[PDB]
Amino acid sequence: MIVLFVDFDYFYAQVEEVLNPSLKGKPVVVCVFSGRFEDSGAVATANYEARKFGVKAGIPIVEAKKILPNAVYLPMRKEVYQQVSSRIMNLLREYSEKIEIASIDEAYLDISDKVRDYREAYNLGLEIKNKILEKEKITVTVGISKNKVFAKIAADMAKPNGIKVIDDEEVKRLIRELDIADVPGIGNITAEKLKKLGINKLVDTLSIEFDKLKGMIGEAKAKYLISLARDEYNEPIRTRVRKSIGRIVTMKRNSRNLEEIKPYLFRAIEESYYKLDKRIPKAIHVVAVTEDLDIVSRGRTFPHGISKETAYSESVKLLQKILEEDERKIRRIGVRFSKFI
DNA sequence: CTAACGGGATCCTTCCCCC
DNA sequence: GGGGGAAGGATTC
Ligand SMILES: Cc1cn([C@H]2C[C@H](O)[C@@H](COP(=O)(O)OP(=O)(O)OP(=O)(O)O)O2)c(=O)[nH]c1=O
Ligand SMILES: [Ca+2]
Ligand SMILES: [Ca+2]
Ligand SMILES: [Ca+2]
């Protein structure tokens, strides 16, 4: 297998840069305002000019303005970014029928049937980089290797407008030397669990007893990491089908009053049913983010599709159950639909 | 009515009903 | 012993 992985660079900020090129060279920060107060919210992404000084995704807006008070702070316009993303994905489909769209800005291409070695796969990587910046003037990063995981690691390394190949021989040195926290699927809770077991490299998973590795990170992550360490990972590129659609809004103030929460729950349903855009769900989940950011959720499924009116009636019953069974004030209320037809 | 913070989605684990 | 569905967890974007 030769897998080609395309990852658009600083993508929300770069799209705003494309629609308004005067922004180029300046630090651009794309924020998600929450409306509790002024500048309440977080950073969706920033470009590298803003990232240089520590303004990156996740940190509060007010924190970013303390660091770069004169940066360009734009509100998030995600469906603008989605239509741009949709057009770029359609470009990628010319280079392989086997393609996996992983998120709004990442696609995996199986180029096994289109090139014979890495040298050609590298050249076609440049052909894709040019065509995207040709047709849409967006710089991307190409990562090429033998499986999805190392193709993504390659792109992580060359990330800002790069292209880089991890060959079979670098895969082996990476198995021995790459920090295991830098492996896709290993966040900090799992990474911290691995270090307390002594594992800091992928090869260490072969030396440890499986049951004690399984006992602390789970069966799936264990087989996953062992498979990578044995150089025997090879999940195929598959078309990913969106399995849920939802929306959760922050209330202007915390509450446990059913009548105060109901408008927000209903607006989540309105916006959620719009995003379904045709497509009928048979399962609904009411999702509450509590006082202290803890997410509670009650749902239920039906032998049939759910109309908007049933979504209204049932969300109230499911919301009542959340307050019946939890004592925390709710801070954000939302809804998720799944199990489509 | 301005208060130390978004939002969307996936896969997996755990528990419990059930064959 | 396992298949299945609900709610919680960890991840990533
Ligand atoms: C990391 C991250 C990204 N995003 C959004 C913003 C990005 O435009 C999009 C893809 O994110 P990423 O690909 O993870 O980051 P990026 O594209 O903005 O920067 P990079 O060049 O390093 O890839 O997802 C979030 O909303 N929250 C997050 O925590
Ligand atoms: Ca990415
Ligand atoms: Ca990206
Ligand atoms: Ca990590």
Note the strand B nucleotides within 7 A of protein beta carbons: 1-14
The technique by which this structure was obtained is X-ray
Resolution (A): 2.6
Alpha carbon distance A78, A44 (integer Å) = 10
Q: Whose C1' is closest to the CA of A289: which nucleotide? A: B7
Beta strand A72-75 with A28-33 is parallel
Alpha helices in chain A (DSSP H): 11-19, 48-51, 61-67, 78-92, 118-135, 148-157, 168-177, 188-196, 204-207, 210-217, 219-229, 258-276, 308-324
Residue A253 half-sphere exposure toward CB, CA atoms < 13 A: 4
Residue-wise DSSP of A213-258: HHHHH-HHHHHHHHHHHTT---PPP------EEEEEEEEEEEE--H
Please, is A264 exposed, middle or buried when counting C-beta atoms within 10 Å of its C-beta (0-12, 13-18, 19+)?
buried
Alpha carbon distance A60, A294 (integer Å) = 18
Report, as residue numbers or ranges, the catalytic residues of A.
106
The class that CATH gives domain A11-77 is: alpha beta
Helices (H) and strands (E) in chain A, counts: 13, 12
Distance in Å, residue A216 CA to nucleotide C8 C1': 17
Q: Any atom of strand B under 7 A from CB of A218?
A: yes
Tell me the CATH architecture of domain A244-336.
2-Layer Sandwich (3.30)
**Domain boundary assignment for chain A:** 2-10+78-166, 11-77, 167-233, 244-336
On whether the A2-10+78-166 domain is CATH 3.40.50.720, my answer is no
Token pair recorded at residue A67: 């660091």
Sign of CA dihedral A162, A168, A173, A179: positive
Angle in degrees, CA A201, A206, A207, rounded to 5:
90
Give the residue from A137, A101, A156, A176 showing the smallest Cα distance to A19.
A137
**CB contact at 8 A, A89 and A81:** no
Q: For the CA atoms of A304, A309, A313, A318, what is the dihedral angle to 10 degrees?
A: 60
What is the total residue count of chain A? 341
Identical topology for domains A11-77 and A244-336:
no
Q: What is the number of other CB atoms lying within 10 angstroms of the CB of residue A259? A: 7
- Take atom 1 of ligand 1 and give the residue whose Cα is closest: A57
Report chain A's C-alpha Rg in angstroms. 23
